[PDB]
Amino acid sequence: MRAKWRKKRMRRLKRKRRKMRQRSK
């Protein structure tokens, strides 16, 4: 695991949880 795909996975998780928070309200 290099830093590029770890950053990509953290970005995807943050985008998913931000979308869930903004559509939950």
Binding site for RNA (CB under 7 A): 1, 6-7, 10-11, 14-15, 17-18, 21
| Smallest separation (angstroms) from RNA to the CB of 24 | 11
Displacement of CA 25 from its chain's centroid (Å)? 19
Apex CA 21: angle with CA 19 and CA 25, to 5°?
115
| Smallest separation (angstroms) from RNA to the CB of 10 | 5
| Smallest separation (angstroms) from RNA to the CB of 4 | 10
- For residue 10, which of 24, 18, 22 has the smallest C-alpha distance? 18
